Amino acid sequence: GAMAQVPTDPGYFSVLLDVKHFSPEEISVKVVGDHVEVHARHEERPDEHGFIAREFHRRYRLPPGVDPAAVTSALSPEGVLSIQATPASAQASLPS
C-alpha cells in the first residue's frame, strides 16, 4: 500500500525555535488569549562608547482544543526552545 501520513489527534501544540545566541534570561514566552508569544533580546556594550543588540519575536496561534494554561517551555543546553501544549478537558454534563 502507499505510504500515508499518520493523522494527529486534535488539541496538541508543538514547535521548536533555535535561540542559541540568547541566554536563558534573554528569552521569554507567554500566552495571550489563544496565541503564544516568544520574545528574545540581547544587548552588549564593548565599552562605554557603544552598543550592540539583537531582538527576535514570534507569535503562534494555538490550535483548536489546546488548554491555554497548559503550555510549557523547555530550553535545552544547546539553545533549542521547545514549546508544547495539551488538550483542555471538558466538564461532564452527565453522571459518570
Description:
- The PDB classes it as chaperone.
- Keywords: chaperone, disulfide bond, stress response.
- It forms a monomeric assembly.
- Rat alpha crystallin domain.
- The protein: heat shock protein beta-6.
- The protein has 96 residues and is an all-beta fold.
- It has a single domain (12-88), classed as Immunoglobulin-like (Sandwich).
- It has strands spanning 13-18, 27-32, 35-44, 52-61, 72-75, 80-85.
- A hairpin with a 4-residue loop joins strand 5 (72-75) and strand 6 (80-85).
- The protein is elongated and about 70 Å long.
Which band does the percent of strand residues land in? 35-45%
The level of helicity is under 10%
Radius of gyration: 19 Å
User: In the CATH scheme, what's the topology name?
Assistant: Immunoglobulin-like
**Structural class per helix/strand content?**
mainly beta
Shape: elongated
Number of strands: 6
- The H/E string reads EEEEEE
Largest sheet: 3 strands, antiparallel
Q: Which strand order does the major sheet show?
A: 1-6-5
Based on the coordinates given, report the CATH architecture: Sandwich
Look at the structure and give the CATH class: Mainly Beta
